[PDB]
Amino acid sequence: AYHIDEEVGFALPNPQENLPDFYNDWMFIAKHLPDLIESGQLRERVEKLNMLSIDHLTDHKSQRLARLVLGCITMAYVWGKGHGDVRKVLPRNIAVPYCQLSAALELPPILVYADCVLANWKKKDPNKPLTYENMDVLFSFRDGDCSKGFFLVSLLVEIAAASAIKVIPTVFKAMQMQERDTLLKALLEIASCLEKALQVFHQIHDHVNPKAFFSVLRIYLSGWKGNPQLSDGLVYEGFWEDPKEFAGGSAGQSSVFQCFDVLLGIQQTAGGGHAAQFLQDMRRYMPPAHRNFLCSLESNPSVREFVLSKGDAGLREAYDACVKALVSLRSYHLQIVTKYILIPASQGTDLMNFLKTVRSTTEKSLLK
Ligand code: HEM
DSSP states (O other): OOSOBTTTBTSOSSOOOOOOGGGHHHHHHHHTHHHHHHHTOHHHHHHTOOOOOGGGOOSHHHHHHHHHHHHHHHHHHHHTTSSSOOOSEEOHHHHHHHHHHHHHHTOOSSOOHHHHTTSSOEESSTTSOSOGGGEEOSOOSSTTSOHHHHHHHHHHHHHHHHHHHTTHHHHHHHHHTTOHHHHHHHHHHHHHHHHHHHHHHTHHHHHOOHHHIIIIIHHHHOOSSSOGGGTTOBEETTTOSSOBOOOOOOGGGOSHHHHHHHHTTOOTTOSSSHHHHHHHHHHTTSOHHHHHHHHHHHHSOOHHHHHHTTTOHHHHHHHHHHHHHHHHHHHHHHHHHIIIIIHHHHOOHHHHHHHHHHHHHHHHTOOO
16 A cells, blocks of 8 residues: 555564575675774775676565665765765765665665664564564664664654554544544544654663764764765766765654644645755655655645534544644654754754754644
């Protein structure tokens, strides 16, 4: 459908772990990034790769794994050890298959949230639940980069949100069939699930320390759009002649908040303002099925107008409960950003303005 899973939502269910043997040379590099970056063999190993056709990647899962593999390699190749020694040309033997794969998957040829979070995970025991203790990531960049903590916690927020995402059909079916009580129950379940997601968000502190995130992991997630270190973007050698700019991987590429924004008729993409066009641009970095889901939601009849049109205090309360959960999420998120980015940096104003603009736009949608 829209590739939304009942259990893990926008996350990729049961991600593939191994590529065909044909790609062993890719997988070896991706699996040893900490060693290869530290020693400085990473770039040589990439430059020594044979050109591997993407023709042996024939299903969505192996394609997604391949994207994850090539994306991590590309971040490691471009940024190296992360202290200004960058590469402006991605060698053809990575760039061509990476760009061809990206075109088939309709994603930009850069590491994105849907790679390093949504597809970058495994259960330790398939017969145990989705808890941090029973989960791991598939790839990290450096020892101590907190990639396991940051990726898995993001993933757990996605999984928590899946419980709210799966009731969205009930919301639109209830409006259609004029089932006031069903609609009211649905909105209350969404708010309650979004509240649960806020509590999962607290696990960031349990598994990410700010020093490692800001000074290590953030480097490998950085992109080449408006980046002075790559002012023209990256050359994808043998695929496009001129360099192209793409933003880096970020939980800001998640579909979770945008999903409930559009659900509730919060028009975050309205206007020419910088917050709107950023959130619009981020959609290009989401899997196409999830882009299409967001667009289908915007085309559905408005939940907000339905609620505003019925003189029904219980419905307005349920709806506001959803808006307030979103506001609460964004408020907590501002704290996280302060802790993981603002303080480590000063030891910027645009970033906090952007986030406050989005929370305020959410807050304005309150009926009370
Ligand atoms: C250490 C933890 C985190 C940090 C430092 C962080 C950082 C940021 C930053 C810098 C932005 C601005 C947009 C950008 O530069 O890409 C952003 C926006 C955003 N982030 Fe986070 N993030 C963290 C965790 C999360 C998690 C776990 C989620 C959701 C699963 C998330 C969801 C979002 C969303 C949806 C936006 C878009 C703004 C909005 O809708 O309010 N973030 N984040």
